[PDB]
Design a protein around this ligand. Structure first.
Ligand SMILES: CN[C@@H](C)c1sc(C)nc1C
Length: 460
């Protein structure tokens, strides 16, 4: 049985509105309804992994697991294994996988983050799951962010608290948050960003939706606009939205948007919005292709419609040579030339680099770089030719070219990371000086850049 080099992953997000689901929810798992939908010819083909995020979920874990497993059995005739389930209040994540993957999956982690302080702590936040699939790390975040059209800044704060404090993936990657820990990171949920148009335009917006004319509405979508201004979800991708707003519907139909202010809404308008979203971030030059992104039309127990997204995701095998794991392979090396970091920091301290990768027996600390002033005020940290030679555990190019090097730039004075980034070893050539580049972030905010040249030696 050959190990896969691709899997397909189903991501679902549904705010259930504290109501039980209807008897049939198979359209969700089949990616049928509005938007970018799955071909009918694929209906019996199981995805490898199903990741289900709910919000306002009134069910016990047992009740929901029984509905999900029975649903997938009806669609695929496969009895899925439970990889993980984690619930914070009414926010839940379930990961299900095909039985053949049971032994390919390891290092399962779960965590949650509660957002807000006093007033604002009690029902919003995130749950997450990570695991290894053979040689590939996968992270999944289901978040329910602050509601309300006039709280986009709060949502962006909730996002930064979640990506700082959610403890998933390899703890040895201590300088790195979840936005660097995984080959593929999927972040979904009721993110609660709204279409930011005047209240008086409610009926105009509904008109536009009925005509399937989403362009003038998406130009005011707060997640698209906040992302464009680098206020949230920096370096994440989202597929084009081609489905109607998934909030706020009258229950038991999809023919009516319930937008008017009510005591029950805190006298807030809920203009039709794309509250329910799926985003991802994969390491550079890994295969990831969105194959569906849409909403169901036939599940109407909630004031939200379920959203689905599916992905092809590249995966690698658990590589064993005669040498590594358990030693280095002297036929392999990674060299760095003409390297410098450019930092936005106003501080003057010395910096060094840390290199972290599962291709190394452990992380590597560089010597201190030499600080200079950039021509436009920047701090430039010059490493020149001074960075160490990295010694990978396996020199075989079929392994090494699929690997990545995480970089942290740290203060000598405090050992705190000022910036994190990632370099792919999927090079155009080996034994050849080639340009490398990564933006650097800290707490998911841009803090600088790292650039230079790499020289990769493999056994070929
Ligand atoms: C360069 N990366 C592209 C896909 C992005 S991300 C984002 C928020 N806007 C754009 C144009």
């Amino acid at each position: 049985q050959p190990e896969p080099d691709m899997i397909t992953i189903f991501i679902g997000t549904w705010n259930m509105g504290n109501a039980p689901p209807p008897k049939k929810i198979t359209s969700w798992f089949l990616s049928k309804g509005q938007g970018k939908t799955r071909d009918d010819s694929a209906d019996y083909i199981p995805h490898d992994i199903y990741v289900i995020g709910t919000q306002e979920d009134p069910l016990s874990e047992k009740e929901w697991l029984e509905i999900l497993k029975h649903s997938l059995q009806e669609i695929t005739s496969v009895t899925f294994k439970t990889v993980a389930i984690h619930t914070l209040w009414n926010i839940r994540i379930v990961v299900l996988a095909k039985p053949e993957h049971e032994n390919r999956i390891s290092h399962i982690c779960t965590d949650n983050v509660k957002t807000g302080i006093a007033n604002t702590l009690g029902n919003k936040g995130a749950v997450g799951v990570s695991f290894m699939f053979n040689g590939t790390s996968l992270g999944f975040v289901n978040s329910h962010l602050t509601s309300g059209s006039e709280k986009k800044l709060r949502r962006n704060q909730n996002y930064m608290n979640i990506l700082r404090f959610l403890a998933l993936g390899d703890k040895k990657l201590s300088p790195f948050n979840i936005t660097h820990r995984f080959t593929h990171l999927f972040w979904f949920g009721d993110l609660n960003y709204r279409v930011d148009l005047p209240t008086w335009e409610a009926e105009t917006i509904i008109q536009k939706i009925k005509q399937q004319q989403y362009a003038d509405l998406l130009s005011h979508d707060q997640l698209l606009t906040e992302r464009r201004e680098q206020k949230v979800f920096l370096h994440f991708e989202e597929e084009e939205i081609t489905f109607a707003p998934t909030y706020r519907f009258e229950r038991l139909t999809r023919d009516k948007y319930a937008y008017t202010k009510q005591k029950a809404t805190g006298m807030k308008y809920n203009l039709p919005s794309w509250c329910d979203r799926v985003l991802w971030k994969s390491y550079p030059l890994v295969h990831v292709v969105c194959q569906s992104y849409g909403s169901t039309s036939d599940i109407m127990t909630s004031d939200h419609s379920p959203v689905f997204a599916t992905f092809e995701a590249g995966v690698t095998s658990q590589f064993v040579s005669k040498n590594g794991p358990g030693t280095v392979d002297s036929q392999g090396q990674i060299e760095f030339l003409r390297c410098y970091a450019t930092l936005k920091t106003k501080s003057q301290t010395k910096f060094y680099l840390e290199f972290h990768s599962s291709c190394l027996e452990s992380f590597v600390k560089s010597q201190e770089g030499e600080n200079e002033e950039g021509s436009e005020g920047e701090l430039v940290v010059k490493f020149g030719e001074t960075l160490p030679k990295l010694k990978p555990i396996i020199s075989d190019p079929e392994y090494l070219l699929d690997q990545h090097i995480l970089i942290s730039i740290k203060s000598s004075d405090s050992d705190e990371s000022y910036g994190e980034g990632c370099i792919a070893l999927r090079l155009e050539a080996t034994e050849t000086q080639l340009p490398i580049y990564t933006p650097l972030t800290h707490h998911g905010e841009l803090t600088g850049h790292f650039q230079g040249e790499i020289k990769l030696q493999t056994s070929q």
